[PDB]
Ligand binder design. Structure first.
Ligand SMILES: NC(=O)c1ccc[n+]([C@@H]2O[C@H](COP(=O)([O-])OP(=O)(O)OC[C@H]3O[C@@H](n4cnc5c(N)ncnc54)[C@H](OP(=O)(O)O)[C@@H]3O)[C@@H](O)[C@H]2O)c1
Ligand SMILES: NC(=O)c1ccc[n+]([C@@H]2O[C@H](COP(=O)([O-])OP(=O)(O)OC[C@H]3O[C@@H](n4cnc5c(N)ncnc54)[C@H](OP(=O)(O)O)[C@@H]3O)[C@@H](O)[C@H]2O)c1
Lengths: 287, 287
């Protein structure tokens, strides 16, 4: 029976579907999406598309009708209090539709977290627990892709990666590997009523990232450590709009305080060997 | 400035208002209610009544308009998954209205609890945390009134209190004392960003309750211990409808497993001496 993926046109959701397509027939996968025009790509691959908007309880009732396994990918997180309402609507719709298994993309080590979004994930986990639906909490790390992407070309150019993270440790993993973990979990037995903290057991620092970028690119790049307020200003000056520049500085600050410093073998046990940071840097730069 | 109480026509809410009326002028209190006709009694006392229905986000936006301190009393708990949605609507309405302080009636020791409703309370606490509003989590014990009420006359008549609680320990406190604690907290400094586990530090067993009922009434009453299924059937046979009889047996079963067996001095520190169980038995029976 069927596997449905919310957030299916998003980056993580699209990768989950691409991994599911290597495991199950396309007819067995259901893409649940807010913008049905966006999901054209998917329909061509033989994946059924349904409209499901977290702001619209009725739309979710219909989208979840008859689905056996649901991958509930968390919403974009501008307004955390709104996100709780949206997530609560999703869980109730899932309960009402008689969904037989629910997997939820949470946040690793949320109980120890110092960023506000951890609260949303824990509230959502408790909401799913009230349903009595067999669950899997896929507690994802921060995305390596947030830090390691084509944007690093700017750092190759300037000779510096500028952050306020200090020597904060980073347990990030790529969206690709987190998507693979979600797909693996959805398509095999044994993961009912389990929580996984899906993080790297080979963490890195920004010093290390600069050294790897230096190695790959041939240009000397240093990590240049600055204050929170120096970071916010550096980013705005580089054309990052003030809200996102604030979010980025806040994530670096949490990192400087150990936010991403805890590890687990859960991910490696689920999917096998993890992608070395250097390979991700090479891909990001196509170098 | 103003203190608003949701669930104001309910048993706990009405007692909070009666305690607030001994501390602050009636004009400073706002009763927020679903059924405005029910709140006639309150309006006669000079308490402002507003319509606020947890199913109606717009109604809550208007009810919370301009309120400084909000006592969010949890909804009735038939459907736990629906309750999460309702509670999420309340918290968002409170955030949007710019409520300056939120107190929430949660459940003591919820993290260790084995009843499903604990999950709702923890989800709601995490929701309130996302707002950044200064909070007080008034984590209430089970109500002594659930077990000790006029219904005990039936036990005086039969010579038996019949439960499936065994020798399970009970840390219950009366609605009256929990309401007093809520009112105390609302009307003094120092309780911002605090969690209180509001329970008895003089717990009791059903054996003890039968002995106290025997003492007060002059008739020998024993505690007669039965199975879960024997309890459910005993209650239905005594005219308790099958859903409530199931809930009652489930609460006794949780008690037999230590659900209400943990204590704290938080309540006694907040309100002073606690009401002896024997005094509550006398009141319940007017004996
Ligand atoms: N761990 C991390 O470092 C990290 C970082 C960022 C986010 N996250 C979380 O992980 C999730 C997935 O990551 P991602 O990179 O795949 O995010 P993404 O590409 O931004 O995708 C977010 C998805 O949510 C959908 N969405 C937004 N509002 C919706 C609504 N009202 N109803 C239904 N769907 C809605 C979007 O659909 P549309 O295509 O219609 O816009 C999009 O498909 C995010 O939503 C976020 O909560 C994690
Ligand atoms: N710790 C315990 O042993 C225990 C036991 C039972 C309940 N509780 C919790 O503590 C709360 C208060 O206890 P209580 O004895 O005062 O309960 P209660 O007398 O049953 O009152 C519940 C209140 O919630 C209101 N309500 C129901 N649906 C609503 C809605 N959709 N929108 C707005 N208000 C709504 C009711 O209003 P109406 O008058 O309009 O019906 C009522 O005033 C309960 O709601 C429950 O969550 C605790």
């Amino acid at each position: 029976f069927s596997i449905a993926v919310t957030g299916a046109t998003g980056q993580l959701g699209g990768l989950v579907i691409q991994h599911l397509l290597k495991k199950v027939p396309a007819s067995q996968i259901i893409a649940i999406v807010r913008n049905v025009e966006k999901a054209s790509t998917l329909a061509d691959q033989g994946v059924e598309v349904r409209h499901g908007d977290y702001n619209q309880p009725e739309s979710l009732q219909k989208a979840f009708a008859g689905v056996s396994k649901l991958l509930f990918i968390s919403g974009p997180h501008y307004d955390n209090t709104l996100l709780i309402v949206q997530h609560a609507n999703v869980v109730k719709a899932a309960r009402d539709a008689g969904v037989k298994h629910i997997a939820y993309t949470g946040y690793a080590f949320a109980e120890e977290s110092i960023i506000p979004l951890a609260h949303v994930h824990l509230a959502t986990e408790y909401a799913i627990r009230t349903t009595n639906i067999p669950y899997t909490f896929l507690r994802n790390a921060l995305y390596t892709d947030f830090f390691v992407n084509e944007g690093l070309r700017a750092s190759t150019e300037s000779g510096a990666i500028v952050t306020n993270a200090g020597s904060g440790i980073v347990n990030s993993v790529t969206r690709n590997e987190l998507a693979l973990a979600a797909a693996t979990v959805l398509t095999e037995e044994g993961h009912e009523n389990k929580t996984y903290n899906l993080v790297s057991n080979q963490p890195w620092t920004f010093d290390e990232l600069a050294q790897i970028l230096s190695e790959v690119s041939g240009k000397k790049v240093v990590h240049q450590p600055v204050s929170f307020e120096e970071e916010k200003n550096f980013l705005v000056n580089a054309g990052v709009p003030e809200p996102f520049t604030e979010i980025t500085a806040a994530i670096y600050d949490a990192i400087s305080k150990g936010e991403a410093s805890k590890t687990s073998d859960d991910l490696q046990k689920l999917i096998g060997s993890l992608t070395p940071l250097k390979e991700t840097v090479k891909q990001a730069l196509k170098m």
